[PDB]
Amino acid sequence: ALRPKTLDEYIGQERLKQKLRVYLEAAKARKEPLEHLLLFGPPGLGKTTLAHVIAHELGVNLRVTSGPAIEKPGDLAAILANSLEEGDILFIDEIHRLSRQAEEHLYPAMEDFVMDIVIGQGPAARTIRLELPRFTLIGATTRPGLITAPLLSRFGIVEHLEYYTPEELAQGVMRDARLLGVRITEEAALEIGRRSRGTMRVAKRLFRRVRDFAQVAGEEVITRERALEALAALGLDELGLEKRDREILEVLILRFGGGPVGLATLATALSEDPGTLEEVHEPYLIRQGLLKRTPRGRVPTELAYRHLGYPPPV
Ligand SMILES: Nc1ncnc2[nH]cnc12
């Protein structure tokens, strides 16, 4: 599991890299106290890596953790007070979902580098105040939504990440590929990029179902056609839709004629979990302008009909 170290080797997010570069160098010169950065990112976008970079650039250690991971305040304290020495980075991924209390503890630490703590148990216990070193916290979010209360207030830098361009993805599919033990023409990779979903995570995660299908017989090469056959066999349209996605529109279009449906009976008749439907497939579908949510129910874009090779109605 080797990944880019330098902010340079990082494939993508130029505006962000520049914006970061500014905050770093300015701080490597000013001081290692990099303000409390907060990366916002569309759902499913690799932020950790960048954190390792931001960490490597600053030349400090990185303690990665999820929002859920922080189970009790203790865990947060035990990290800021021990694991971390001045200048290090505590990465609270998915920071939007922290423990009500765990959060309340992050406030102080982020603001004045001092966290209190409920020592002992019952009425036979007291409260101590632990002084924390100067560290920088990087919070990442899948739900940029202000679904981050005034915890937002205590942040220095607050940037966003855009999806990755098919090329950036390919550049990554190939960069990650070749060095990994498989060889594939750029056209091939880039045909996987396009198929991916702006997500690097998915980019490499798809390539995995390609390099596992084609190079089984013929080994030394994967050309577009090769990859193509692969993607093809796997059920991937030039639009990135997985076999199922298609079917969803399919049913929408045919079963309910596309007319307002209602996640309710769609998931039901579509024989699937509403949440699954709504939480897993619908997204990309809406983003690709194929599906649309309306007060009346789920409906399919013209483009849907036009994609599934139908006559966009009336
Ligand atoms: N920026 C990036 N470059 C290469 N591989 C990555 N994996 C996740 N983010 C990446």
Ligand SMILES: [Mg+2]
């Ligand atoms: Mg993580």
